[PDB]
């Protein structure tokens, strides 16, 4: 509870120090009420001057409506379309990769967006905030982390070795190491894997500038379900388990994963 008050001090500045909001979000978990605000400031959706906030959100609102309306003009979306699919189509239009028809199949990258859009939907209730956060969150993965994300699978082994080499050995025994759901962990950032109440505490860190956190979440999953995994003896049996993990343990997993991340990377 003492943590929440120190944040409110940062939020009272007429001009928000984005640097300090990161270092806070890195160290501490965000209060539920302030999550949307902080994420928006860090992602550049809102500027640091919180007198402009109202005026800027107006632009973001008009943009949302303009785009959405355009999709209805070209018969790309109707009221029957799910909201996550709408956000996808809006994102495609804004980034200039709208296909010719809705019937055209969805490519791998589109299904990543769709998984995240569904996760964000539970975290953020406002349609406009949800879209804009999803947008900038996913855009961050393909720009700020374009060269970082592909190197996480290598790091996942390296750091698992440092916490439990025998478990790593067992994975390599079953030739299961190469077939782990790396795309679920490091392209979708655990969207569809962990429940959103826990997952958002992970995304606190991803927004605030660190993608390496995702590795230590993945590591902690294996540590947590060690006994269960060591019982299995097939790459296919192992992967199938990791794609449908128990949802009740995820609260602990995230907490432990953050400690693990702080331990190995020694954040300021």
Partner 1 sequence: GQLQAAESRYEAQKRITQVFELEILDLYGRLEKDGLLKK
Q: Which residues bind partner 1 (CB under 8 A)?
A: 44, 47-49, 52, 55-56, 59-60, 62-63, 66-67, 70, 73-74, 93-94, 96, 98, 100
Nearest distance from C-beta of residue 196 to partner 1, angstroms: 28
- Closest to partner 1 by CB, 54 vs 227, is 54
- Closest to partner 1 by CB, 63 vs 239, is 63
- Closest to partner 1 by CB, 47 vs 195, is 47
- Closest to partner 1 by CB, 91 vs 203, is 91
- Burial group, residue 156, by CB count within 10 angstroms (0-12, 13-18, 19+): buried
Nearest distance from C-beta of residue 115 to partner 1, angstroms: 24
Nearest distance from C-beta of residue 127 to partner 1, angstroms: 16
Q: Give the Cα separation of 113 and 207 in Å (integer).
A: 16
Nearest distance from C-beta of residue 263 to partner 1, angstroms: 37
Determine how many CB atoms are found less than 10 A away from the CB of residue 146: 10
Q: Give the Cα separation of 17 and 105 in Å (integer).
A: 44
Nearest distance from C-beta of residue 70 to partner 1, angstroms: 4
Longest alpha-carbon distance in the chain: 59
- Closest to partner 1 by CB, 61 vs 172, is 61
Residue owning tokens 């964000």? 120
Nearest distance from C-beta of residue 142 to partner 1, angstroms: 17
Which ranges in the chain belong to alpha helices (H)?
Answer: 2-11, 18-27, 32-42, 53-73, 83-94, 108-123, 127-141, 152-173, 182-186, 196-207, 213-224, 226-231, 235-242, 250-265
Closest CA to 148 of 203, 194, 214, 67: 214
- Closest to partner 1 by CB, 45 vs 229, is 45
Which residues lie across from 19 on neighbouring strands?
A: none
């Amino acid at each position: 509870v003492e943590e929440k008050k120190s944040l409110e001090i940062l939020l009272k500045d007429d001009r928000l120090d984005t640097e300090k909001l990161c270092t806070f979000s890195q160290r501490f978990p965000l209060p539920s009420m302030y999550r949307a605000l902080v994420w928006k400031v860090l992602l550049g959706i809102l500027p640091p001057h919180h007198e402009s906030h109202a005026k800027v959100m107006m632009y973001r609102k008009e943009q949302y409506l303009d785009v959405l309306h355009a999709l209805k003009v070209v018969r790309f979306v109707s009221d029957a379309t799910p909201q996550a699919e709408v956000y996808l189509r809006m994102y495609q239009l804004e980034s200039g990769k709208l296909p010719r028809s809705p019937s055209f199949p969805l490519e791998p990258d589109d299904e990543v967006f769709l998984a995240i859009a569904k996760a964000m939907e539970e975290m953020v209730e406002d349609s406009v905030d949800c879209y804009w956060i999803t947008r900038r969150f996913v855009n961050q993965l393909n720009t700020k982390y374009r060269d970082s994300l592909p190197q996480l699978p290598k790091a996942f082994e390296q750091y698992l070795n440092l916490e439990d080499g025998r478990l790593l050995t067992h994975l390599r025994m079953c030739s299961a190491a190469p077939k782990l759901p790396y795309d679920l962990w490091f392209k979708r950032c655990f969207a569809g894997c962990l429940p959103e109440s826990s997952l958002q505490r992970v995304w606190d860190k991803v927004v605030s500038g660190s993608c390496k956190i995702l590795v230590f979440v993945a590591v902690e999953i294996l540590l947590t379900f060690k006994i269960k995994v060591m019982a299995l003896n097939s790459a296919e049996k192992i992967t199938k388990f990791l794609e449908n993990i128990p949802q009740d343990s995820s609260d602990a997993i995230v907490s432990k994963a953050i400690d693990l991340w702080h331990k190995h990377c020694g954040t300021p």
